[PDB]
UniProtKB/Swiss-Prot annotation, chains A, B:
The chain holds residues 50 to 282 of 282 of the full protein. K(+) binds at N65, D130, S166. The keyword NADP applies. Homodimer. Interacts with APOA1 and APOA2. It comes from Mus musculus (Mouse). GO terms for biological process: lipid transport; membrane raft distribution; metabolite repair; negative regulation of angiogenesis; nicotinamide nucleotide metabolic process; regulation of cholesterol efflux; sprouting angiogenesis. This is NAD(P)H-hydrate epimerase. Catalyzes the epimerization of the S- and R-forms of NAD(P)HX, a damaged form of NAD(P)H that is a result of enzymatic or heat-dependent hydration. This is a prerequisite for the S-specific NAD(P)H-hydrate dehydratase to allow the repair of both epimers of NAD(P)HX. Accelerates cholesterol efflux from endothelial cells to high-density lipoprotein (HDL) and thereby regulates angiogenesis. Undergoes physiological phosphorylation during sperm capacitation, downstream to PKA activation. Its main location: mitochondrion.
Length: 233, 233
């Protein structure tokens, strides 16, 4: 079996990657975001969806998960989806301001407000991507995310979550949280993933040095040939 | 047909990407390098080669082409090749020092000297990747690259060149230059590509905004589904 990480382990691994291996944040974010866009294209391919091109709403939170989200939006566009982004709390750092410009000049729109009703999200967006919080989340969700999650709970279209379903406790999960249909675990799954019950669980972020994966006993599966995602069972 | 760029156009396009679209160098280098590793895995797949794992020598020059090369080495390793790098002139900038550390801690070795004979390269390396010079090359080749190219001319194993065959004039090419077997054109092919006669010509760097590709009339082909390379005919 593949190993499921504690928050401690995840922080240890991610820190190892940036200090010991000296990957820069935008290198891994680029790969992670591409992994997601690809997981999404394998689970919900365009041709298999009613709208042409198919519409996606990507909701990006205030840290790196949200960053993954912007990369993901951008690769989705190139793969033939029509994404829209909602990005309410934007850190003022070059990485993020660059990512925002990139999507903008690719004619990906940033909504000014979340559609206030589940029904409206449903009529406009055939898939929704949860790029709000990731593994370093803790404590009560504060605004505007409390009420964003609340809308999400009511949706009838599928949710795809990046790394962790936002709102779940990173290890123990959340019985009344959002229940996504696709979960892309980056690098390795996290212990909350044991509580996952959607249809699709993909593993992404094919950048793990063998030496890091051996040190932490990750038991990563073999990604087939040149693929950057793997479906778990 | 796809359009073949002048050095002017290529500089115009690459500058547009970094200023107008504000991609950072390490974002596009990451994608370009992955495109290459994938072009190489589609043209020379591991299972189809005598050594197990198959060995590759990646020769990196003193600018961004060489940077593409280090990214490429690194994805090749993950795809199941056993790459070795030769990187003689290393710019002292964080981007490059990071890339070097990454390969190092992935147990990719950097040779201290080029094997001095074509025969020796041939016996040790089943493929050689030319990541020396790209489209901003001009004037006489100076050391150590003059004599590196010279060894390359003598090889009997295949050469894969990134963007341009190093040593060719960027538009007019080079009748007595190296003659690679695979050419990965990044973003768009360059006019020297008309003088290409190897077996495989792939197009890589799937990151072109529609609006940039329309402005310059690139006539990029449709990359199939989620692929990051396309084979030209
Ligand atoms: N790469 C990906 O990057 C992710 C981890 O990176 P990251 O450190 O940026 O983590 P993150 O999951 O993106 O979120 C952490 C940040 O989000 C905010 N936050 C955390 N809990 C919150 C809460 N309960 N209510 C409101 N805001 C909260 C804080 O920023 P603010 O103070 O700005 O709100 C915090 O610094 C992983 O998922 C990994 O896959
Ligand atoms: N992304 C990729 O990035 C590439 C372009 O980026 P780049 O500007 O870094 O170009 P490059 O093709 O990597 O090489 C340009 C640099 O190489 C050196 N150089 C150029 N001509 C030379 C010669 N005749 N003899 C010895 N050294 C020479 C110079 O650096 P030094 O002065 O340090 O030698 C020059 O600044 C493209 O191929 C694109 O696909």
């Amino acid at each position: 079996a593949v190993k499921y990480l504690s928050q401690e382990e995840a922080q240890a691994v991610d820190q190892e990657l940036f200090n010991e291996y000296q990957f820069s944040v935008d290198q891994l974010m680029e790969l992670a975001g591409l992994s997601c866009a690809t997981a999404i294209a394998k689970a919900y391919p365009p041709t298999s969806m009613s709208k042409s091109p198919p519409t996606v709403l990507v909701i990006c939170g205030p840290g790196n998960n949200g960053g993954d989200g912007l990369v993901c939006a951008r690769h989705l566009k190139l793969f033939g989806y029509q994404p829209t982004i909602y990005y309410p709390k934007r850190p003022n750092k070059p990485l993020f301001t660059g990512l925002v410009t990139q999507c903008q000049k690719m004619d990906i729109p940033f909504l000014g407000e979340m559609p206030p009703e589940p029904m409206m999200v449903d009529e406009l967006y055939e898939l929704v991507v949860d790029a709000i919080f990731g593994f370093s989340f803790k404590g009560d969700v504060r605004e505007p995310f409390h009420s964003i999650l609340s809308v999400l709970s009511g949706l009838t279209v599928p949710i795809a979550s990046i790394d962790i379903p936002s709102g779940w406790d990173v290890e123990k999960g959340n019985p009344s949280g959002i229940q996504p249909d696709l979960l892309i675990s980056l690098t390795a799954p996290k212990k909350s993933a044991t509580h996952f019950t959607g249809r699709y669980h993909y593993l992404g972020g094919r950048f793990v040095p063998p030496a890091l994966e051996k040190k932490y006993q990750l038991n990563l599966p073999s990604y087939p040939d040149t693929e950057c995602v793997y479906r778990l069972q």
